[model samples]
Target: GSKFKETGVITPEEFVAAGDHLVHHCPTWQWATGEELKVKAYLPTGKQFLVTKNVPCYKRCKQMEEDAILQTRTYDLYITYDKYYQTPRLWLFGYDEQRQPLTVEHMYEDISQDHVKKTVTIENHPHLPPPPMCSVHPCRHAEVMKKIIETVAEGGGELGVHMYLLIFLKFVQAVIPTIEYDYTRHFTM
Candidate 1:
């Protein structure tokens, strides 16, 4: 059933549609494919996931003092459809200034304290290569989205399925607050 508008959980087709809409407004995100054998039959060919590379991570999460380091790292972020959860999941592959992969411990420094050990975990991304990446767990995504949809309704605004990823990216900021990724918020209500 295509119940995304009511439940905040989307079908594969809806995920693809929302993905295309996101790429339209934010060109930084591009559709990508995984291994040929790993492709999900329901999704479009070569469009298994959405990726944005070179996203800047300005500083560590704990360094909030006056003499903090301003060194800039980078992140390769991925948005993948979780078939089991029927929601979008975010995977983060971060790098240091020298272009080396950040260890799980180092990557933890960029994630929010509230979500560090609880909402986030290291897992192998089904659509990406080896070396497990840190991802924001999708277990409560539906609940969060549901609440957001309800809040928008209370404000006299209707949210569309096409704007799913746009809203998803917005809320995910709570996990990675310092990564200055781009999303189009001005075009939609």
Candidate 2:
């Protein structure tokens, strides 16, 4: 059991635990309600590698596909956090089986360097309707942390990195209706 911090920032050990805990405690998110989203993060990285697997090609093309076998590919992503933007960042490097460094030209929306830099920041609190960026948003992140802190004072379980991810998914669930994420539905841990 490690100490919990009120800040949304997570320590390396906590990050490690989130991914490891996902081996059993993991929940699923999706582009749509029933679709399975395979987003795996190995934070606290020497390489910062994130792999998004088996995504539907046409579903990514903004249309619903019952069976689109073509335009989509698995992505190798590099995840990084922005201290100034205070948001998680990503860099695309390659495809499903292709293992070398690739460019962002194949991708749309350009998740290139300093992406979402000007628009993303962690407030001291999570408020609804963040400045102008309504499509992607954060809600009650610090408040969640604050709650965990109080729970710790009352002898709650240790705030492991896995615990932080579980709490985060809870907050995100409250804010978004389309999000299919719940890292805590199972208690087998």
TM-score of 2: 0.38
Cα lDDT of candidate 1 equals 0.76
lDDT of 2 by residue, 80-182 (tens): 3333434333322224335432333333322311322322222311111212121223322454446534543444545454555445444333332222224
Best by lDDT: 1
Model 2 worst lDDT run, 10 consecutive residues: 30-39
Residue ranges of candidate 2 with Cα displaced over 4 Å: 1-3, 27-80, 83-156, 185-189
